[PDB]
Amino acid sequence: VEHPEFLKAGKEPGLQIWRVEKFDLVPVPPNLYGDFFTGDAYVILKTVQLRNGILQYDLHYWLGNECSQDESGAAAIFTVQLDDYLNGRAVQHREVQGFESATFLGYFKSGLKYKKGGVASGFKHVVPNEVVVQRLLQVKGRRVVRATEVPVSWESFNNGDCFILDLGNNIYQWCGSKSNRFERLKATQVSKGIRDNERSGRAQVSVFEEGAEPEAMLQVLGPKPTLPEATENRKLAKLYKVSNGAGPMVVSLVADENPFAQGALRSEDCFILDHGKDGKIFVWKGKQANMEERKAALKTASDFISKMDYPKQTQVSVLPEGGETPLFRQFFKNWRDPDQTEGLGLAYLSSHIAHVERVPFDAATLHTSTAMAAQHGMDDDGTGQKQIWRVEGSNKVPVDPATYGQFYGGDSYIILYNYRHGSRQGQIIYNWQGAQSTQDEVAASAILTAQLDEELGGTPVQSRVVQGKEPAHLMSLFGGKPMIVYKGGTSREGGQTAPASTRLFQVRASSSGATRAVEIIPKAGALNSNDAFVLKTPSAAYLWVGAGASEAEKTGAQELLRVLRAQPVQVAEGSEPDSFWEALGGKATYRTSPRLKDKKMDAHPPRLFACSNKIGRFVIEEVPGEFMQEDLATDDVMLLDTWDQVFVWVGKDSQDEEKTEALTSAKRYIDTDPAHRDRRTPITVVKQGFEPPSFVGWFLGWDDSYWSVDPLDRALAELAA
Amino acid sequence: VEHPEFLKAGKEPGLQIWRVEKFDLVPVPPNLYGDFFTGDAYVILKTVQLRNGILQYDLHYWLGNECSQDESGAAAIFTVQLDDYLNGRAVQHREVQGFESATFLGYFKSGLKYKKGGVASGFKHVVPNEVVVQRLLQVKGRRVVRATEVPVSWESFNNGDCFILDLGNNIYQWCGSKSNRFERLKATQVSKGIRDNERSGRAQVSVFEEGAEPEAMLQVLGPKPTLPEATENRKLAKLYKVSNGAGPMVVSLVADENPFAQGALRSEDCFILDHGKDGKIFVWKGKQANMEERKAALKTASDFISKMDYPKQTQVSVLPEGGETPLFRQFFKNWRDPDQTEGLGLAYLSSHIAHVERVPFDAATLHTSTAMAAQHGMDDDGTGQKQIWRVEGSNKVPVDPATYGQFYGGDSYIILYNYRHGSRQGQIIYNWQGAQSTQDEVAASAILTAQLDEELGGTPVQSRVVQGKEPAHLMSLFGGKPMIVYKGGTSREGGQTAPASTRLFQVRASSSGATRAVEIIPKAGALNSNDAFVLKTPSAAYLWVGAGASEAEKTGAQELLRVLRAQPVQVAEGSEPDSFWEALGGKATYRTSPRLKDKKMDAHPPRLFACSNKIGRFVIEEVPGEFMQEDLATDDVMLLDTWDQVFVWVGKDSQDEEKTEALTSAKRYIDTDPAHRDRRTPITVVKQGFEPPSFVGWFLGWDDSYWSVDPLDRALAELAA
Ligand SMILES: Nc1ncnc2c1ncn2[C@@H]1O[C@H](COP(=O)(O)OP(=O)(O)OP(=O)(O)O)[C@@H](O)[C@H]1O
Ligand SMILES: Nc1ncnc2c1ncn2[C@@H]1O[C@H](COP(=O)(O)OP(=O)(O)OP(=O)(O)O)[C@@H](O)[C@H]1O
């Protein structure tokens, strides 16, 4: 038999939810997805279509707080057995009521309902046409909304939250006096949800505020009393080996600090990546491993949590070798996988960007498409008017228009750019900060950038970049010329100081076709097979063009040579005269790392976070699922972490200290990241109502007028409308 | 139209309940009678068949605590209009959730359910086969049980009460650790009730005790926390006249203290009988009155309660002249009504004795019928063996067998009687207490009576009687001879002291045909048309036999004369020589009051009460409805108030102080009665398992084995059986 629902499972892309009922899988009806009984356990399978057509599986089992020891054992058993039937390629997750993963929560954008009861109490997710209902839902959460069934009583209430008194044909949404308007909008989505999905749109949602409680409400609840107020270093992990059956657990430390070596993961063994400080652990299953310790990976994860005195509700993932997720992969130094040089996409595609249509860059049609803008980091073609300045002292000093495109590493600059994307106009201010610029000048450039923003109305995008990690759009501001970055001194008055005798330049290109030439230390083990290089030497000048390189960096490298007043010696990779090598002081290992080009997004999917400087305390909460304009709360500071770049979207009604610390908050986020990632990553401050295309292009249903009418008033004009 | 439910109304004996729904009468389904929404109002019509065949109506409107001002106005409007359609002869009642009259509560023996919600909240008494249910009922009350729907939460709970977690197919009765076993038996009746009446017997009642909470319960409620403890001169009234439309209320005091004169009630006017101290008022509607102030009697009652600052939930009855109830009639001096000399029964028949078959007395068949025994106060024919004793000092002294039947008012006696009723055997101890007996001797007789009880095993009935108010059974212990009671001195040694020259004797008969001759003051205004009298005078002796008198008192009076050693002069009433009248010292008003004979029970229906000497505090709570053995809690002291007599039934497991104060408790009850009733009323202490026929005869389904198996264990062996 093997299990009849196993044959229904994982056949097409979609989401499938079974509830565990007396050691059987019973399908939850699709219209009630997101409903979960508190005394039950469930299995959830999400099937994603990978770009190469092959299928992807995330298996979760979810455990209610009032769950039996038996019902949850069955959920695990089925999870393991379903993974087995899916040929052991599924990523597995243990999810616990109130504490479930960002992936899981993303499946349910209308939110979760935690219901009272379960199988043992006789309740099911089914309901006779004519159903009588009398329940109270307490709605909690900004980013991830959770409606919990509570006792039908004023004792469940407070003056901070929203509540829904569900009377069947009539749904009564009540919102506390201290309730914020964003939370109301959310409670509204939930109310709408009950009406549309239970009920079949055959119900009247009316909505009220504390003090104006209606007849129906006061009838079932009695007189309203005085109500109470509502109730209100995670970067370090360790890696471990593990050899057991299920009882005699052998746990040996392999790496004491992240970032970890990818080579520490070996196919014979199994490891636990202990990120338990931040509420998460992973079990990695080597592809040879041992069938009995692969199959007991959940039990092993359990034993580890017990042995370490981490909470029960600690999240758990088990990934098989080759089926790793970004979250997992982030903890390692330089993840690579030889099979994925060629192919469409990668072996995993994060659910929240699975629906995103990939659009390749096309200068001709860029004005036509915010999606393209977003995916290649280009707010426009780069041909708009611009002022470039150098910071000297406490002043902006016009750079000589002849040198536009040349940036010196002893300086910090500010650029003012006007952008046109037909659809949208605006301004970007780039603050380029030299790696050798004095601290006072760097800092000065930042304050001056911030001041220019203020004098210009508050509207312009504000982007900090650091030498070497130039964003796509800044590289392309110079016609077809490359952005030249010298490692050396300055370009002021008699800042003077001439050349180093021997200089190397790496010439890297972007999606847009633009190039930057960065001056680097002239060594052999800094050569890169994907770029053009230029080696200026007292003798002559070499134009090394690598195997993986293209026309764009060839042409960009020789346009640098004109500026350097030298003449090239074309030379393909590997067949190079050894005056070349003697100029570098030897000959060493390479980089032949063919770049994650189109696959950038797959390896490092964009992620949306909320940001808080509340009570001298820095917290980030991920908003899960597909990106939505509605999640951008007008009183919040948000972070859109493309990998290339970190946008910080600042809401009009956010606190003034918070939106002044926008750049600092983005840095904290970047410095705090478990991936131990490039501290030079560009940060881009964007303001509500004045978002650039490369930001809005990540949000499918972006609406320019969305805030033109207060979003809550619109939502309400559909429920009583 | 007049109202289609009006035509369905009051046609046959029975109970009808409509719920008020948007100014309409909608019938509650009969299986849910006793269910009432807390935010609704209802109309309840109880039709009783009077013994003459004519119909009787009690109209209640019931107001939930969460009731609208509009829904309750409609209830009143319908009540008044329904009374009008029933030709104005209904008795009317304003009933309020939690505070409803003894009559009303008597209609619902399984108890009442107060439900959350109502019409405005969308809830109805109907329910789709397949209905999902999840509710909590808190069960409260000993005599009148009330299950209230409460929030589904441990916060609703306490360690004292019983609760029912109704999950639909499974009903979970929980009983606190401090919950007494009688209360559990009741909670069980409610649980059974839900199973049988909702659900159609298609549900599993399981029952539990605090500490043993089952999976289903803990699943919907969460882990059980520490639970809290459960939460724990009314004889004086005044009469008032009242002349108004509905606003300008004129209220004039007519009588300052009860007992009231019946003549104070006059047909032109309306009165309020203010017993608001005890939670009750009455409006009496004169039969000429004035149609507009008759029809606004409820609104008048309202205005009175406001003007007097009595609680809203104060009970209200409006009775029409001639349609008065016992509760009402009790407040007056000597209620009479000329039309009811002849006829079958009276104009009102209290609902709780409406089903009682009247069995007239028949010596031949008395051993055959406990009903007869009860209704005439005869535990048997009276021919059993008996010892009579006189109390002299601290001793019982055998009375001379020749004088048996002669009792002297300067003595107190005790009689030990053995009774046989085929069905039942037992013993009665009568303690007769002379009106002229010294206090020490009276008291002595009581202690000696109590001691004889104890020495005889605890089993015998124990009956205190006072000279003049002899019970039926004691009169009939003397063959066909009358019970002679002298007002004078004693019958001991040389207690001696001879006659008064002129002596009168009243000779009254009972149902059984037995007579007592009582010596009274020889006056004309003590003559009574229903009795035989005997007037001994130095000259000769008169046998006055009244018009209303019968053979029984004739014969009884002349058997007294033989004992008095005199010879009679027969003389019918009205035609009497005036040597007769000169012996009495004149000639005055009579009594021609033809006795309430068969109608005794109608005028003064028996009533069952629980009794408590708890915290130096004397409380009586009426157990309403038809009399049930099940209501006789084995740990309680109860009072069965026949009018003639007050039984006090003492439960085996009642406290020792309480059952020693049994007689005193009965007296307190009698002295406390608003009727200001005869303080000489015989009190009869009866013990659990050893109840006499004249007690058990009032209980239709009396079962001798009922306590042979603990009643709770039996009830439980039907729910899980
Ligand atoms: N198959 C993959 N799965 C997960 N991560 C990958 C994969 N391939 C490359 N990466 C990681 O993500 C980054 C992308 O590799 P890529 O070659 O595109 O970066 P790079 O060109 O070496 O340097 P840069 O970060 O400046 O682009 C690297 O840090 C690499 O370790
Ligand atoms: N129609 C009636 N309705 C209500 N009470 C009545 C009615 N008739 C008589 N009674 C009351 O109840 C008692 C019964 O009247 P009845 O003539 O039977 O008593 P009695 O013979 O005068 O004295 P006793 O109480 O000793 O029998 C009286 O107190 C009387 O006021």
Curated annotation (Swiss-Prot), chains A, B:
Sequence positions that bind Ca(2+) 5: 410-411, 441, 490
Name the segments for region: Actin-actin interfilament contact point.
70-73
Residues covered by region (Actin-binding, Ca-sensitive): 373-721
Question: What is one term from the GO cellular component aspect held by the record?
Answer: extracellular space
Keyword Ribonucleoprotein assigned: no
Q: Which residues bind Ca(2+) 4?
A: 268-269, 293
User: Which SUPFAM superfamilies would you find in this protein's record?
Assistant: Actin depolymerizing proteins
Q: Where in the cell is it found?
A: Cytoplasm, Cytoskeleton
Give the main location. cytoplasm
Q: What is an annotated GO biological process for this record, any one?
A: actin filament severing
In alphabetical order, the GO MF annotations are: actin filament binding; metal ion binding; phosphatidylinositol-4,5-bisphosphate binding
Residues the entry annotates as binding Ca(2+) 2: 83, 88, 90
Residue sites binding Ca(2+) 3 per the record: 160-161, 183
The UniProt subunit note reads as follows: Binds to actin and to fibronectin. Identified in a complex composed of ACTA1, COBL, GSN and TMSB4X. Interacts with the inactive form of EIF2AK2/PKR. Interacts with FLII.
Protein name per Swiss-Prot or TrEMBL: Gelsolin
> Which species is this UniProt entry from?
Equus caballus (Horse)
